[PDB]
């Protein structure tokens, strides 16, 4: 809405209570959507002259799409929004606006990969509450999305070429934060619960557990098939369904929501030991949904109106 000209404000996404409030109160919502089309078909008939066409309405499948959720500041307050298109979440924003509500958020429970999120408007951006603390999750934000196709038949598809170009970019931004001369290495999770070891994410009431080892296993800056297919198990998980008071909200069924999506970011963790091999190791992170929320809420903070 209003652009506060000549104002310099200090943000701190790591001490942002919006993140805690959303994580606590926000539940996914779906609504029936229609994507109608028309088919045009020449009515050739005998024997080669088609001076007629048939116009038909088609694509009558109804699926459920996620409804965007907006956080709105209470009466007597407002939301400051950083417009610097490469803000690292901490420090001075030399270009600030005042909005009544956040951008629309389509919540998705996942580990390792952030889906259906917001893209970096300029370059690939990596963030962390503390890059020195190898126990803080590193949040990656891509500037172009990598498509991932997922079927109830238990597998997901990612173009290898697209993924390799994404890894090169991410690994170029990590070399820029940990040493402009260091080998960047991606490896699989080191163990733990299913939700953590696999690319775990929801699709309605169902959760996909995807073997992600094909995605995180390569070495960079150290001088196959065209499609990556990830094997997936799919479980229902009723204890994750939105429960508000007495009522429980049962999401649309399996054939109702499309399980494919756009990867807009990653969650990673960097290894320790400080082995000055001049080469850092990175693995798929997640499990802490607050990290997910921070990846969308980094440019907001609530303040009193005066």
């Amino acid at each position, epitope marked *: 809405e209003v652009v506060l000209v000549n104002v310099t404000e200090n943000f701190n996404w790591c001490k942002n209570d919006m993140v805690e409030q959303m994580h606590e109160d926000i539940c996914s919502l779906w609504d029936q959507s229609l994507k109608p089309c028309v088919k045009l078909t020449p009515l050739c008939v005998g024997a080669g002259s088609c001076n007629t066409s048939v116009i038909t309405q088609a694509c009558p499948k109804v699926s459920f799409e996620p409804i965007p959720i907006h956080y709105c500041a209470p009466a007597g307050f407002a939301i400051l929004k950083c417009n610097n298109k490469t803000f690292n979440g901490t420090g001075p924003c030399t270009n600030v606006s005042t909005v009544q509500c956040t951008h629309g958020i389509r919540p998705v429970v996942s580990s390792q990969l952030l889906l259906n999120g917001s893209l970096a408007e300029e370059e690939v951006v990596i963030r962390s509450c503390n890059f020195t603390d190898n126990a803080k999750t590193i949040i990656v934000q891509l500037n172009t999305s990598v498509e991932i196709n997922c079927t109830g038949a238990g597998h997901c598809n990612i173009a290898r070429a697209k993924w390799n170009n994404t890894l090169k970019q991410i690994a170029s931004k990590l070399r820029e934060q940990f040493g402009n001369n260091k080998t960047i290495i991606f490896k699989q*999770s*080191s*163990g*733990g*619960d*299913p*939700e953590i070891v696999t690319h775990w994410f929801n699709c309605g009431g169902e959760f996909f557990y995807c073997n992600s080892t094909q995605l995180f296993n390569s070495t960079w800056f150290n001088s196959g098939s065209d499609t990556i297919t990830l094997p997936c*198990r799919i*479980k229902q998980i009723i204890n994750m369904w939105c429960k508000v008071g007495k009522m429980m909200y049962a999401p649309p069924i399996s054939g109702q929501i499309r399980c494919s999506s756009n990867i807009t970011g990653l969650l990673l963790t960097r290894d320790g030991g400080n082995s000055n091999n001049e080469s850092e190791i990175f693995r798929p992170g997640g*499990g802490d949904m607050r990290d997910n929320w921070r990846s969308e809420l980094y440019k907001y903070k609530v303040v009193k109106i005066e």
Partner: antibody
Amino acid sequence: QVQLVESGGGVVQPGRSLRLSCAASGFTFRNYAMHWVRQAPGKGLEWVALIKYDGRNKYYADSVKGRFSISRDNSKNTLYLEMNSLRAEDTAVYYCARDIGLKGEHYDILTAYGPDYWGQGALVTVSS
Amino acid sequence: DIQMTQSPSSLSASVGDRVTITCQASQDIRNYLNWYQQKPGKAPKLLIYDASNSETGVPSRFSGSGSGRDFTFTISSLQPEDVATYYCQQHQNVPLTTFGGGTKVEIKR
């Protein structure tokens, strides 16, 4: 080096309560589910409780159901077990144990994959 | 609620012998079954997870086979240090159950 260390064992009289803890190190605690298993004098290993990585889903054995409580503190890397209304039967060594991850040899999503590392244990003696 | 049976309850064998413990489940548990070893006083160590997979650092002489309701644990060449009580344990679903007391293995010398 995966290490688990139980603390807070000793005597406690019938009816009263007691809370054991387990200090974890050598691995990323907040990624692994955790188990409590107990073994009475000269008897067998009896599974007591399980808590998942995010400390949300908890599972109990019928015997201690309603009297025992399991929880974790991923910030301090410790696992807790609080026991109430203790009886003579509850006298035993209590082991904390780390559930195996999802290893590449598995091919299904289960509630547990069984322990791999165990602590040395802490003896709890219910007596007056 | 699944019940586990092991056999024998206890046995004596000589150094170098092949020892073969069997486990049985009251119902189908695919291969979701672990074997543990507990020496007197100490805490159990894992030796085999999911029926046939050998845990890291575990001597080559320890193996496991089976699936469904019937399983086998095997020490190919019994050593003096292998004296212990062995427990089998299912994880098809909680409560995780075993055989009360397991199987005690002793040396005859």
